[PDB]
Paper text:
Here, we present the crystal structure of the class I fructose bisphosphate aldolase from [name] with the reactant bound at the active site. The purified enzyme crystallized in the apo form but failed to diffract; however, well diffracting crystals could be obtained by cocrystallization in the presence of the native substrate fructose 1,6-bisphosphate. The final FBP-bound model contains four copies of FBPA including three residues of the four-residue N-terminal purification tag and residues 1–340 (of 343) of the protein; the FBP ligand was modelled in each monomer. Here, we determined the 2.35 Å resolution crystal structure of BhFBPA. This structure has clear electron density for FBP bound at the active site. There is a covalent bond between C atom C2 of the linear FBP molecule and the Nζ atom of Lys223 of the protein. Furthermore, phosphate group 1 of FBP makes hydrogen bonds to three amide N atoms as well as the side chains of Arg295 and Ser264. The alcohol groups along the linear carbon backbone of FBP also make hydrogen bonds to the side chains of the protein, as well as to nearby water molecules. Finally, the O atoms of phosphate group 2 are hydrogen bonded to side chains and to nearby water molecules. We compared the active site of BhFBPA with those of homologous mammalian enzymes. The similarity to the active site of mammalian FBPA A suggests that the design of a specific inhibitor for BhFBPA (that does not inhibit the human enzyme) would be exceptionally challenging and would have to rely on exploiting very minor differences in the chemical environment in and near the active site.
Author numbering:
A (entry chain B): 0 to 339
B (entry chain A): -1 to 339
C (entry chain C), D (entry chain D): 0 to 340
Write the structure that this text describes.
């Protein structure tokens, strides 16, 4: 019955061509985004920006199954006085909560990271459940170059921490989003799509091996991986190649028991993220749903149009709704260049 | 590259169009045991007659059987009409294959468990078998089971490791390998529950695929031949529906979608159980792989009884084989009923 | 060179027949110990009790290479105004810091635990180094019973956390004590010495495998294991058998590169813990130093004599000094029962 | 008692400054050696050559604890009509048998190998025991270059084959020599001593991990590794550095429970091989015996001097006796350059 509840939550998050808004940027990460448009990163600006997204009615009702939140935001109220989690729920979306405390340097493995956040997590999860969160998220950052990175050590240690995080979540009634990101836009980003395929394959294999050993219910989780794609500074793979290779790697490494895969955008352009997802959804019947869990690819246009100003709310919401809808169509395999 | 693509094509043919595999690969000792039960002397010539009878059941072979697993001897044997037995198989649109393991032997330091031998010289044997018309291969790992101590992690991993060594060799030779890790329902202990079989099978398939992965086996170019999740032969209480459900469940958790097909062993189930179970699994809606059969006993026991070692009974024994072939053909399509007989 | 420094500190911690006072009890644990002798667990009483131990100059100067501390104590002043760690350093002992945050229930593994503490551990270690700590400690708790506990999953996950801890300690300039305790005094305490042998074997093997994968420098760490011993409520093994079996499991699992092994007392009586260590050091040349890292076995008698009373300070110091000396003798293989009198 | 006998055999093989004569070269391998000095590789020349070694009284009695034999040689008679195994036993040396069937290309791992010979091994071992063999040998060949080779896969599969062999040996009552050789003299051989150090470390770690899992008794086996040394065409490591790094990697990876380590010479010169072993034994107390299992380093000079002629038996036996003695002194840490005179 815990299993049944988790299964139902996971299915709702990937159901009916809908997908996840990744709005869970930590203070430093959102500060970086805000700084790129010359906006000051205050708490009120963060609230106002998020409120603008979460009251974007069309997108929130028709396209967004869930929203991943950062801790601050989960506890924040709208200007109207209503809890932001309650706005999210009034649109028929499920609130979720990012619980990792960041990717930190891994001792003895230079240029690689290990994600922290397991300490006190049982207790944080119970609190988050009480506040209405029904899923969680943890991000593992996997560095990549032509040959030396990533190491098996870094992969295994990150997969082990993901498994620990995932078992705890399920124990508290929350569906874990498991995010192992092979970086397309890291410090080294000239790798080929072939190199990304071989690394992603080993990463997903190890991730699922560790989830298995830690007794994680595959039916009650969601995978949020990178697509198989070349590095940002060496992009030559076509939309078709990206889609074909991505789905090929998933067939090999993601058990059919997993109900959905919601991709990260990872540095891709807005249109790329949509085109790639759409082409994967026209490759014939798949054992899991393929959808989006996009941060940048859902937000970057909204953020630029917003520009920190109240008078830009509507025009910001339009950009967000438009990208939400294109990605909805992508989740249905129905997107075309013409619809942009 | 092109060769990988070819391995997929062969693998897909073996599990496509509601067809399945005839497991006719009994070793000398094994087929001898099956002959002794019906009072027929186990000689080369009787083994040749028996198998020729199966392969000349035209309608069964043409319409139901995609491939035949053969033992070394049979692959090199002539039919009484002068052609190779493999010619008959190919004339019926079926693909010949070859069992390459040398039997499940006792595993040092693991009492009551076995390890399968046959890797020595396997590269050269595979090359020879390909020139003899074999396009796929087979290796059985035998996994013991009881309530709590068997099977050990060690016995499973060592078997999984030999299976992977085998699979990589087959694929390099151009043969699709059938990977057969059987958790015994009919072993020395056989009063275990279906929940126990579920858990054991889960760890076996997990470890098998972990080792296939590490040995760089192409999942798209192989076939799995597992037991179904079933209670022990002497404590059968689980329903058809529960066997179907729990089997499909464990496979969705452990068998990658890249694998084109799963062809079940009958394992000591009755003819009708094996058929019903397969049909009820294909009635559960859409799945990531094909579900079909690779049955020995469940395709053969009845025909062998009707044959009874006598040339006069070729017609009748063929009838009884044609029937089972057709029933399991319907099961593969999810169209079997007890009514179809 | 920073590798060479870790080696030096580790060697110092197990050298010259000296050993480690394990005084790192967390608030709840030291509370339980004070409650037994009817003493209120206040910050002041904890300070008073630790100050009594650290001012027992005879024992601290002769027997104690190092002191494992809890966070609070590392930051505490003596009644005389020095830092408590000044007293420890003056006696020639090295201060150390326990850095784990406790053994919590492990999701999906009923009745087993996982140790927390890795979050922010880099920054804590850095800060702890500036407070004078030159080694650290982390405890994995491994439950045990006749057949089901511990699970391989619980050991693996606990070994993996240990390895993460150890790599961080060495990066920060501190020697990690790696403490995987198979409990003799948990809920199940009627298990055999054979059962402990088999479980400790798997625990230590798994621990050193994970340390190896996480690039831990074996030459710059200390192991603090349980001795191989039957459960507390089913004690049959003689002194010789415990010593022999313990050394045997260590020769099988603990690399020669490790400089010292400092045992936990684990529920054994004060005399048992002394006698077992002495017997182990009377077995001839070994590839690592064998000494003590005792809590109860160095403190139980001193605590009882102290009885939360300033007037009992001298008598408590004498009790501690005696047990320190006996254990000093054990570390040299020179203890006999005569010398308790 | 099985354990106790394996242990005793193992101890004898590394005891008292003695070491193993590796004379188990297969037909193809001995043919390469013979062709080098212009001698036809016939069965009679192989018999005559080995007879010459095994009747070198002084060398066989004082330096050689055991002789590894190829199958053919184990079944061969001397010119006098006596079994060669009896000649070996009459000098106080124990006969042993190499049981692998060669290092073959590993499917899906270009430029790497996997060693065959597990099939029918239980039966071969039982026959070898009856014939007087009391230990066995199996060689895994690990390719090496600057970055890409060896792969984890190749190491794992070879370690797993090694463990299967070792378990079977012990069951039949033979002590398995476990030989995992990182090549200094394969296709690529300009790798540095640091690179060899890292590769050898992962190899030895993986080997012992798999032996552990396969329930191999550490106390009843012998390791035969390469020394830690740079490639043949990039030799810069001093004698002292090789000795030091070799002993370092062994303390990291080879359990104290293992009674002995007997190095392969691996393409080193005769003198290097002796000097390195001697330096290693001058580094103070070690947890295991360190000695030799030399093929080329004990024979090259004898073979050259023999030159395929009966006329040179004495001059060949003299050159073999001198190397046997130089290596005996090395096993004792007593070799010097001056003793070559
Ligand atoms: C399949 C399963 O057949 P059924 O279990 O459905 O009979 C077959 O390939 C068996 O594994 C095979 O008969 C075993 O033969 P053996 O290794 O004993 O010579």
């Amino acid at each position: 019955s815990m299993n049944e509840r988790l299964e139902d939550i996971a299915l709702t998050l990937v159901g009916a061509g809908k997908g996840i808004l990744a709005a869970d940027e930590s203070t430093a990460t959102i500060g970086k985004r805000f700084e790129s448009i010359g906006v000051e990163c205050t708490e009120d600006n963060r609230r106002a920006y998020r409120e603008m997204l979460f009251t974007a009615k069309e997108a929130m009702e028709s396209a967004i199954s869930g929203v991943i939140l950062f801790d601050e935001t989960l506890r924040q109220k709208a200007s109207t006085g209503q809890m932001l989690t309650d706005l999210i729920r009034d649109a028929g979306a499920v609130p979720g909560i990012k619980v990792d405390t960041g990717a930190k340097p891994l001792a003895a493995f230079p240029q690689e990271t290990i994600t922290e956040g397991l300490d006190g997590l049982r207790e944080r999860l119970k609190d988050y459940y009480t506040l209405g969160a029904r899923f969680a998220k943890w991000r593992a950052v996997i560095a990549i170059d032509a040959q030396t990175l990533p190491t098996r050590g870094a992969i295994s240690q990150n997969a082990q921490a993901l498994a620990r995080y995932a078992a705890l979540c399920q124990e508290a009634g929350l569906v874990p989003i498991v995010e192992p990101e092979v970086l397309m836009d890291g410090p080294s980003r000239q790798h080929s799509i072939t190199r990304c395929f071989e690394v992603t394959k080993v990463v997903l294999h190890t991730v699922f091996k560790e989830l298995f050993e830690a007794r994680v219910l595959f039916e009650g989780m969601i995978l949020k991986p990178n697509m198989v794609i070349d590095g940002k500074d060496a992009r030559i793979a076509s939309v078709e190649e990206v889609a074909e290779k991505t789905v090929h790697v998933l067939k090999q490494t993601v058990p059919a028991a997993v109900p959905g895969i919601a991709f990260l955008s990872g540095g891709q352009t807005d249109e790329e993220a949509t085109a790639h997802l759409s082409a994967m959804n026209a490759l014939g019947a798949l054992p899991w749903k393929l959808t989006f869990s996009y941060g940048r690819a859902l937000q970057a246009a909204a953020l630029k149009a917003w520009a920190g100003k109240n008078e830009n709310i509507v025009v910001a919401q339009k950009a967000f709704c438009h990208r939400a809808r294109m990605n909805h169509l992508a989740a249905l395999g129905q997107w075309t260049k013409d619809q942009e």
